[PDB]
Amino acid sequence: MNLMLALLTNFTLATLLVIIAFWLPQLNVYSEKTSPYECGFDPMGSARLPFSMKFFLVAITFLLFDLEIALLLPLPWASQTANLNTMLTMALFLIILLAVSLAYEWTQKGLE
Amino acid sequence: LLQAEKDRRVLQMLRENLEEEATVMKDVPGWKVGESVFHTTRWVTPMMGELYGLRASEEVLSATYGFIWYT
Amino acid sequence: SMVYMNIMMAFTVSLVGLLMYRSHLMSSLLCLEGMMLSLFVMAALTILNSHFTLASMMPIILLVFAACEAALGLSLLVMVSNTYGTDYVQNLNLLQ
Amino acid sequence: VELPSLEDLKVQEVKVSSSVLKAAAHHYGAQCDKPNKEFMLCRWEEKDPRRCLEEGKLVNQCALEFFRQIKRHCAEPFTEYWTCIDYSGLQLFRRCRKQQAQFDECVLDKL
Amino acid sequence: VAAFLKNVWAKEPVLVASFAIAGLAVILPTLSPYTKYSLMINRATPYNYPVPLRDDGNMPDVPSHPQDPQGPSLEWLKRL
Amino acid sequence: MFMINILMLIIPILLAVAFLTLVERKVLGYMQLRKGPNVVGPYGLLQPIADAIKLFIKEPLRPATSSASMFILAPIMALGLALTMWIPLPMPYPLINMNLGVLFMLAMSSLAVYSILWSGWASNSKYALIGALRAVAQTISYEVTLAIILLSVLLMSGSFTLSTLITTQEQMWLILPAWPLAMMWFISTLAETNRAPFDLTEGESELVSGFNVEYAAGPFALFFMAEYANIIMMNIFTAILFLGTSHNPHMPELYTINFTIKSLLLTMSFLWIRASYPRFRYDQLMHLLWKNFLPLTLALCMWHVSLPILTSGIPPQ
Amino acid sequence: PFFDVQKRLGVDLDRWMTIQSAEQPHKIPSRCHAFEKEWIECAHGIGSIRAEKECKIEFEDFRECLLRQKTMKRLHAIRRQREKLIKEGKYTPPPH
Amino acid sequence: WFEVLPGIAVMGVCLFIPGMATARIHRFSNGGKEKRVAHYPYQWYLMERDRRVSGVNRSYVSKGLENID
Amino acid sequence: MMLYIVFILSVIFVMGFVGFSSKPSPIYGGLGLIVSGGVGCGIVLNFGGSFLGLMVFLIYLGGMMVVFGYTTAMATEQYPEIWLSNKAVLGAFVTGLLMEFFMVYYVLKDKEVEVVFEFNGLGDWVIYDTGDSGFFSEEAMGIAALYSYGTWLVIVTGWSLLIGVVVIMEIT
Amino acid sequence: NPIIFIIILLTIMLGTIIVMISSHWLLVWIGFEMNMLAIIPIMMKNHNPRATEASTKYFLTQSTASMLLMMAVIINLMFSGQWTVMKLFNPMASMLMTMALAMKLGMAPFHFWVPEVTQGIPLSSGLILLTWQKLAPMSVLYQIFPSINLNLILTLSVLSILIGGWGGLNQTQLRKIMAYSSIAHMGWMTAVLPYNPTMTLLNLIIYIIMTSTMFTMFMANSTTTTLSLSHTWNKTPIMTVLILATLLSMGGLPPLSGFMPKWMIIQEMTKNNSIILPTFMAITALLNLYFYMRLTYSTTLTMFPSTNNMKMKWQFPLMKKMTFLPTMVVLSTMMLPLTPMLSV
Ligand SMILES: CCCCCCCCCCCCCCCCCC(=O)OC[C@H](COP(=O)(O)OCCN)OC(=O)CCCCCCCCCCCCCCCCC
Numbered sequence A: 001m002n003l004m005l006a007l008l009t010n011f012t013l014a015t016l017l018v019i020i021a022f023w024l025p026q027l028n029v030y031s032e033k034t035s036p037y038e039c040g041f042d043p044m045g046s047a048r049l050p051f052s053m054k055f056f057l058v059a060i061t062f063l064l065f066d067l068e069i070a071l072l073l074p075l076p077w078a079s080q081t082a083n084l085n086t087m088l089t090m091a092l093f094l095i096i097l098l099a100v101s102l103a104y105e106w107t108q109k110g111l112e
Numbered sequence B: 001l002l003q004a005e006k007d008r009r010v011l012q013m014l015r016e017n018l019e020e021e022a023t024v025m026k027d028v029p030g031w032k033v034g035e036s037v038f039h040t041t042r043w044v045t046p047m048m049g050e051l052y053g054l055r056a057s058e059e060v061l062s063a064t065y066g067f068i069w070y071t
Numbered sequence C: 001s002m003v004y005m006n007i008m009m010a011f012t013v014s015l016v017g018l019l020m021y022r023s024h025l026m027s028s029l030l031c032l033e034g035m036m037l038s039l040f041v042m043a044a045l046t047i048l049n050s051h052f053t054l055a056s057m058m059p060i061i062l063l064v065f066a067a068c069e070a071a072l073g074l075s076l077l078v079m080v081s082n083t084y085g086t087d088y089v090q091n092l093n094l095l096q
Numbered sequence D: 001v002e003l004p005s006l007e008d009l010k011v012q013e014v015k016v017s018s019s020v021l022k023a024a025a026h027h028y029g030a031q032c033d034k035p036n037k038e039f040m041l042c043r044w045e046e047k048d049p050r051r052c053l054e055e056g057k058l059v060n061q062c063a064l065e066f067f068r069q070i071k072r073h074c075a076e077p078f079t080e081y082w083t084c085i086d087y088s089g090l091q092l093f094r095r096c097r098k099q100q101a102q103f104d105e106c107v108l109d110k111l
Numbered sequence E: 001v002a003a004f005l006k007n008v009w010a011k012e013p014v015l016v017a018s019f020a021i022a023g024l025a026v027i028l029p030t031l032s033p034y035t036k037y038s039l040m041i042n043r044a045t046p047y048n049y050p051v052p053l054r055d056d057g058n059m060p061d062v063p064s065h066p067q068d069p070q071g072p073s074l075e076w077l078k079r080l
Numbered sequence F: 001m002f003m004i005n006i007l008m009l010i011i012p013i014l015l016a017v018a019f020l021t022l023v024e025r026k027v028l029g030y031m032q033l034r035k036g037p038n039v040v041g042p043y044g045l046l047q048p049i050a051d052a053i054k055l056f057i058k059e060p061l062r063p064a065t066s067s068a069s070m071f072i073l074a075p076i077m078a079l080g081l082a083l084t085m086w087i088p089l090p091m092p093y094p095l096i097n098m099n100l101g102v103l104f105m106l107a108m109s110s111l112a113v114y115s116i117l118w119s120g121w122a123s124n125s126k127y128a129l130i131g132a133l134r135a136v137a138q139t140i141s142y143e144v145t146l147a148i149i150l151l152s153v154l155l156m157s158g159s160f161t162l163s164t165l166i167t168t169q170e171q172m173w174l175i176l177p178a179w180p181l182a183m184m185w186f187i188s189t190l191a192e193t194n195r196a197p198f199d200l201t202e203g204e205s206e207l208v209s210g211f212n213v214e215y216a217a218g219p220f221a222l223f224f225m226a227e228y229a230n231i232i233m234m235n236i237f238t239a240i241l242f243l244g245t246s247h248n249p250h251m252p253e254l255y256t257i258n259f260t261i262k263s264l265l266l267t268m269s270f271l272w273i274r275a276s277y278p279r280f281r282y283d284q285l286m287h288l289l290w291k292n293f294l295p296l297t298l299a300l301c302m303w304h305v306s307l308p309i310l311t312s313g314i315p316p317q
Numbered sequence G: 001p002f003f004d005v006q007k008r009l010g011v012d013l014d015r016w017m018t019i020q021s022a023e024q025p026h027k028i029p030s031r032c033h034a035f036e037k038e039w040i041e042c043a044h045g046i047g048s049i050r051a052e053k054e055c056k057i058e059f060e061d062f063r064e065c066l067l068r069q070k071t072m073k074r075l076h077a078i079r080r081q082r083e084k085l086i087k088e089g090k091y092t093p094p095p096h
Numbered sequence H: 001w002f003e004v005l006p007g008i009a010v011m012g013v014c015l016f017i018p019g020m021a022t023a024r025i026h027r028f029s030n031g032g033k034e035k036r037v038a039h040y041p042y043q044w045y046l047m048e049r050d051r052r053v054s055g056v057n058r059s060y061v062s063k064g065l066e067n068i069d
Numbered sequence I: 001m002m003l004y005i006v007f008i009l010s011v012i013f014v015m016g017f018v019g020f021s022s023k024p025s026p027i028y029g030g031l032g033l034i035v036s037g038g039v040g041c042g043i044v045l046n047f048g049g050s051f052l053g054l055m056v057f058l059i060y061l062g063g064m065m066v067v068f069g070y071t072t073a074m075a076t077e078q079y080p081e082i083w084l085s086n087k088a089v090l091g092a093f094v095t096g097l098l099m100e101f102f103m104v105y106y107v108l109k110d111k112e113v114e115v116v117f118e119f120n121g122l123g124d125w126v127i128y129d130t131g132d133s134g135f136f137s138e139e140a141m142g143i144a145a146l147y148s149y150g151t152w153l154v155i156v157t158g159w160s161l162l163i164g165v166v167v168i169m170e171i172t
Numbered sequence J: 001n002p003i004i005f006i007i008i009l010l011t012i013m014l015g016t017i018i019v020m021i022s023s024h025w026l027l028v029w030i031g032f033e034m035n036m037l038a039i040i041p042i043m044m045k046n047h048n049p050r051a052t053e054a055s056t057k058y059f060l061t062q063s064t065a066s067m068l069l070m071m072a073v074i075i076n077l078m079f080s081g082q083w084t085v086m087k088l089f090n091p092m093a094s095m096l097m098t099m100a101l102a103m104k105l106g107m108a109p110f111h112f113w114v115p116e117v118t119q120g121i122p123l124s125s126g127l128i129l130l131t132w133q134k135l136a137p138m139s140v141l142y143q144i145f146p147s148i149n150l151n152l153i154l155t156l157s158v159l160s161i162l163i164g165g166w167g168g169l170n171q172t173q174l175r176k177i178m179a180y181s182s183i184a185h186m187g188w189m190t191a192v193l194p195y196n197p198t199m200t201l202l203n204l205i206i207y208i209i210m211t212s213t214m215f216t217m218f219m220a221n222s223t224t225t226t227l228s229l230s231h232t233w234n235k236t237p238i239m240t241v242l243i244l245a246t247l248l249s250m251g252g253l254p255p256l257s258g259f260m261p262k263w264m265i266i267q268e269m270t271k272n273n274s275i276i277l278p279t280f281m282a283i284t285a286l287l288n289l290y291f292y293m294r295l296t297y298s299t300t301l302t303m304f305p306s307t308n309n310m311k312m313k314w315q316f317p318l319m320k321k322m323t324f325l326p327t328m329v330v331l332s333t334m335m336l337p338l339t340p341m342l343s344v
């Protein structure tokens, strides 16, 4: 029944060392200037986070290449099998079905 | 042989969980002894509650959750 | 058993007042992807004890569309903020 | 339902371990062949293992004599054979492949 | 066209190495007789238990003793 | 005495990340023609026990314009998964016999980027606001360079357990039948775990902008600590996969001796790369994943599907 | 409308993953495999409008094979048959 | 080329501990034998059988041929 | 350690949803899913099928939960806040929180109350209810993933994703 | 752009075939999943900020209407485990089934799916493609048919024409006037579906024809009712006579062939001793005609063609399959003794 006590040791040793390093000398008796100087070298920066298109398409493109490796995941379990002409010719399909999705998008990526 | 030593376990388990149930209470608004829940008289497999009844103390946990979370 | 009531109580993470409302529409698309795992789990508890041996490929395929579905829906939610900067579901122009 | 008694139980049970059962295990099944293969027809071809209790003892009683023969004739290479294969981890068969013929030096010949 | 397989391999020899491994991979299972042994090995690995049959008239083959010359040819692997 | 085994594995490895910071610079020093830490040791050897106490005396400020519950939760998840990943790993016996644990490595290596997305957001503005958004973007793209060619050896191993990964290599040292995959296995972990040539993560990263830019030495002491715990763990994972040692059941002592010598050698390379090569200028970093790394990885994937079939050499499971 | 192309030309598009007792790749059945094969034997040429009120026996036990509804109730009430008489004797059985 | 070898020799020992520790717990907790692994549910069935019949409550003590004579 | 380790997980999973089902300022919405996704995987990693649970970390929690947090910066980048520090969040948190206990309160804590609320009891060890054991094939759950019989299944789902890129190769 | 516009357009009808060719609830889930994936580009083409704020009001309405269907499958997965498309074995499932699917066909509840999309899409060209999504779930209610509660399927259908009728007398925008009376013609067919579920398809095949020929007439310039004035004396006066004929046919007047369904559909609704049910609906579609009269009072009476602009040039659009539509959508009432023995 240790899996599950194989990690709750590891996280309660993790959260131990945080509060002892951070929070315990955070109650110390120094002067502790609380003035708004804590931000470094970008003093005010009175703006909202602007949209960047070339850093959105990187999120979606990965997600659609991430799905069909989980289809591709039970290939070693698909070895000790019955009829294997089917198993080979279907395994080669998905990879090409992943490969074409490159080549269409490959004619327009952008400065990624 | 490993099959023929396993089926002998559950009939002992069914007998003790019935014979030490038939001596518990014989009420007139109670049970008949030897009945089944189903209409069809054919040997269906038993259940965890059939073998290990209302006991549920230690060894029943090692029976169910033994193979999972470890050797 | 009680392992199905919880979780069938947890299917009410649709709840339709919080399936399109209120604003910050990302909060509504959140529970659209979080309505899965109340279907991915509620299927997986039933195929697995009752040894079907074949229908357990269906929970694998249940993610594959709903990921591609929600990814499409997230593309358009940039387009509502590409024109504005804020999603804000109390945007309405085309009346009904 | 109706069950057989507490009698037709409590037979002479083979109380051995896992590796010593898997020790011989190979010479075992391929040479008895009357009580056990017919017991499968008593289980597959007709179900309800409450009817089929005779041949459950026919496979068991002959297996009692299988180990009783191997104790009297040749047990000196036997006990060291399942010694090394009990040196555990998956119980491989390629580790004690060297010491397998010292057990089978006479199993083909003596008995 | 015979220069096209030598004047793009001076510019981008990256995807050319991919097609060279994409090709010569679909082609070979139609070629060597090592395949269909890959299905022959994979057929005679017993997972389940062999249930027996019953004598009724036939008696085609394979009597009660297994080590008799009774069954088919799967003993070419030990010689392999 | 299972509980005495876990503490016998967390504690002797915090020295090996503290006695790597010292060998970080002695090895990097003789490349520059200069000695190691000369005066405090005597040979250096007592440097990190003095260089650790200073951090926990020095005042751990929190930034005034920061959030609260996110800023102090990412170093909890930093050391959590940096130390939990050491569990299912055989040497020669693992602590845990997972049925399928090779996949559990990616179940642990996936969530590490979900702290960088926190800490870049949790504290403050532009030198870690957008400057950490383009550090999540490089680490997500090097899983599909990783997960494919991790699967590309499993068609030859046979299954998902790690005990078969030592059994299949008793006569081969499997870097030979797959040496094109072994190249791109290296550069992936060289760029995913945020190291020196592909280095828009830490401190070479516009040379000013990092996720370390705001943590004072209280919470900062783990980030560095935890991070150095990944880099000796992809090295302990490469040398159980390609360059596999020999196991003898009667003598398990000679396993580890011949084993720890090998993971140390690959760990030298992460130091020995940094003293040669310059950076990659974020475009060309990702310009060589899609265009250049990726189509070869599918090519060998289709190669390693057919070749176990048309050899009649199916691995048994 | 239900065109049923796959009955004309003999490919199975799916048809195999439908019911609980169809193929079983290495022949490991379910927990209620014995009642599926028995119940489908009932209504084959029957047009299903008389099958709802004629067969009615081979379906009901099969519903009660799968959920074990009254089997768990006959078991639960034995916890109230005894187990108020914890202190009134009858341990039954003594270990083991 | 000299002083870097003590820097190695403290790190290098620090991974010789956990390999030798765990290998001498499983071999020590179960009495000079390796630890039984069980990947498949059939392989669990041998141990849980063996616990019922070995001597008291253990899967790591043997019965032997001489037990049943 | 108890027999009730499954039931004690699922109540957390129910309370994981009520965390983000109301209105938490969509960066703590990530802290409603990753909590629930692991706790939900704590349920599925019982019962035998471990491969089907460990994929929920890789493809859902590893794939979609980065992109769901890789946005909320490029859009919806207003000045952030925390839930429960406002009045509209706490008023809905407690509403199901009682019923999260009240459903548990009388489903079986009474003897049998009375006819309609006693058909499904809590426990005991019949939650798994899988005895007896099996064979050395797989769990299984293991020999289930097939590039055998299902071919019409894969030829759609492969091809349905291929138009998934071409729809998003445009508008953006 | 041109070739990929077919492959998007081709797979729309490939999504709906798998809905019909299926013996398995998993495949009918995939079937009109990918339709909701492959309509979203057709909404976009010219990128106007109403269209982007219209497809997103289209989108999540057909995400939940998808999502409740998979909930309805997994309930009767627990009950008897058969997955053939047939009766659903559970009244808690079939109730959740029918009023989930009532959003994709939109009935009278689940209301504003129909006007809020179809209005103001700058692609008014077509958007004849909203006849497939009325065709896929009707192919699902042909099988589920002997398992319903018989009250819900009528209460969504009695409300259908009573509120699809009133909704559009207050309109000018003729896309909404086509969007309305598209709930009404979904009211006549699912009021009948429990009673002899064929002679439902008769109403549907008529409804595809008469609506498809309405949009092709509209593709000269027509946007608004005031624009429907200014083409009688300008474009072609034969267009004014044609646009009269189809509307008066689609109102159900017995000299034309939109009276072909009702005339037959009351032959089935009574014969089942249900008389107060058709007499309500038959008198309800009467103020479904006051759309069409008062629309025909615009174009066919020369109502103010001002702002002198001459179209001295010919017309070259593509009026594809137009010459044969108002010759089977008007003149067929004598020639159908049995259309309901071909389709039966
Ligand atoms: C800030 C502090 C507060 C937070 C503190 C809590 C943080 C906890 C975060 C830990 C996240 C780790 C989750 C990893 C889950 C994967 C576990 C796993 O898959 O183990 C492998 C094994 C699979 O079974 P198998 O390999 O077949 O066993 C051999 C049988 N012969 O499986 C097994 O061996 C046994 C399976 C059952 C074990 C119990 C269930 C495991 C999960 C329990 C924790 C629940 C997760 C908590 C939410 C995670 C949040 C990140």
Ligand SMILES: CCCCCCCCCCCCCCCCCC(=O)OC[C@H](COP(=O)(O)OCCN)OC(=O)CCCCCCCCCCCCCCCCC
Binding pocket: E014, E017, E020, E021, E024, F180, F181, F182, F183, F184, F186, F187, F197, F273, F277, F288, F292, F293, F296
């Ligand atoms: C028919 C039978 C079958 C045939 C089988 C044949 C097998 C062939 C195997 C080939 C595939 C394996 C080789 C992998 C491809 C190499 C990666 C690559 O393509 O890099 C291209 C990169 C792009 O740059 P370039 O194209 O050169 O243009 C700029 C010129 N001005 O240019 C580069 O060179 C970049 C170099 C790498 C970038 C990172 C460098 C940082 C330092 C890394 C050092 C790593 C050292 C080794 C790793 C450890 C090894 C154990």
